[PDB]
Structure 1
Amino acid sequence: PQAKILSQAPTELELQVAQAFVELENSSPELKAELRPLQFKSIREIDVAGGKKALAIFVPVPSLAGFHKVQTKLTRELEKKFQDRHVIFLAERRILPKPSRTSRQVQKRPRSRTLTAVHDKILEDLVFPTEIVGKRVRYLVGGNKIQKVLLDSKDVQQIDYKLESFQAVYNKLTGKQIVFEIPS
């Protein structure tokens, strides 16, 4: 049921991922009990400068915690099957435009529906399960934003091999440049 777990739009790699996903359901009595209603929206394939590529799994919002129960073993199994594809979970957060001076009647846009909140949720989920312990934005002399992001010391090694992939993801989704660091 690879089109069941997809949503009205088949794509080649989406059918591959959903097929492997049903196969991972079949290798488990309880992971199938969670992952069978857990559908997902779409994918993005984007290459890194280290030879391989990465897959942003676009997941709907109100099921993301159930993924966060299970995304550890699921990213492990999907890094087993589809090699040289770094597995990333990103949610689908529709932004709203900022109203101009000639802006016909639209309701009070939530803070979550803004640009920067969605970018912050992106950075929250890119380094799941570890927590960003701080953001320090460095402004160069030529006026070039480099966002330094700090990471914890509990779950280093799960993300430590995925760093340049995360840089490529963030420089592709918005064009802003970013540097991760783990403090001593």
Structure 2
Amino acid sequence: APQAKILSQAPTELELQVAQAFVELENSSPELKAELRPLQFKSIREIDVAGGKKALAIFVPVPSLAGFHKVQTKLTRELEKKFQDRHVIFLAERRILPKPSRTSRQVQKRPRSRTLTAVHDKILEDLVFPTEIVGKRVRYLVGGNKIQKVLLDSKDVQQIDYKLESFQAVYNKLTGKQIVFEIPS
């Protein structure tokens, strides 16, 4: 049973469909299976897109992100292909530890890898996964609101030019901040 095997937890129908897709990809087999057998995800989050589609957020343990990062292209192509009406993307379950206060207090202090801002920055880096961000800008709007511009490279934006709003909605839903992307020319 490489179905509930490859997550590493029982639920649920979405993740199981995904796992059986993984399995059907593994059955390719040779080059795909070779690096797709160790790569397991943990959970999935299906959420809205401003258009019609939904968006798959595939959560990961983050020692697997390397092999996941080697592929991403073929998993996003095949999963978007099979599970249509969707925008697929993988992400890493990064633990956020709370900020030390006088009430709450923790030994094994709190490295900056585990802080919130870093985790949020990395989430963006994985949403894009390709296309090394050229810049970030943050407008602070007079209505006390905040928006982040993320400046992308023109290379390989064709692969994700149809996912921007989904990424925006995702980051807004998880992190709570508004978002926009941009490519200089």
- Is the contact made by 2:9 and 2:42 (CA closer than 8 Å) also made in structure 1? no
Return the offset for 1:150: 0.5
Aligned residue for 1:173, secondary structure, equals helix
The CA distance in 1 between the partners of 2:150 and 2:55, in whole Å, is 20
Aligned residue for 1:91, secondary structure, equals coil
| Residues 136 and 105 of structure 1: CA distance in aligned 2, closer, same or farther (over 3 Å) | closer
Return the offset for 1:172: 0.2
Aligned residue for 1:157, secondary structure, equals helix
Aligned residue for 1:87, secondary structure, equals strand
The CA distance in 2 between the partners of 1:78 and 1:37, in whole Å, is 18
Return the offset for 1:175: 1.4
Q: What stretches of structure 1 of length at least 5 have no aligned partner?
A: none
2:157 alignment partner in structure 1: 156
Q: What stretches of structure 2 of length at least 5 have no aligned partner?
A: none
Matched, 1:71 2:72: yes
Deviations 1:102-143 (A, max 9, x none): 344422211011110000000000001111110000011122
- Is the contact made by 2:92 and 2:123 (CA closer than 8 Å) also made in structure 1? yes
**What is the percent sequence identity of the aligned residues?**
100
- Is the contact made by 2:62 and 2:92 (CA closer than 8 Å) also made in structure 1? yes
Aligned residue for 2:58, secondary structure, equals strand
- Which ranges of 4 or more aligned residues in structure 1 deviate by more than 4 Å? none
| Residues 105 and 119 of structure 1: CA distance in aligned 2, closer, same or farther (over 3 Å) | closer
Query: Residues 22-171 of structure 1: matches in 2 within 5 Å?
Result: 22-171=23-172
- More moved, 54-63 vs 1-10: 1-10
